[PDB]
Design a protein around this nucleic acid. Structure first.
Length: 49
RNA sequence: UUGAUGUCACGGAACCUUUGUUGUCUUCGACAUGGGUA
């Protein structure tokens, strides 16, 4: 995909437990892309003291 | 812009002295990546 925001989960590394999502993909050349990230980080409770 | 019976100024070489020098093998292997799980 051209947009990183449009990348969605396509598979699971451990299909038994429905965990560890993986987005398998391929490009024009002989390259295979495996992603093991599906959650970002949310910062909260900012401290000014 | 001179002064007058007296100007060798063609009477005088910008001349003389200082090294772009010194130092460097066109060489070559370990990663890259950030979480995910609970």
């Amino acid at each position: 995909p051209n947009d990183w925001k449009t990348i969605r989960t396509n598979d699971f590394k451990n299909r038994k437990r429905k965990n560890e999502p993986v987005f398998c993909c391929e490009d024009d050349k002989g390259n295979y892309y495996t992603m093991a990230k599906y959650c970002e980080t949310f910062f909260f409770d900012l401290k000014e003291n």
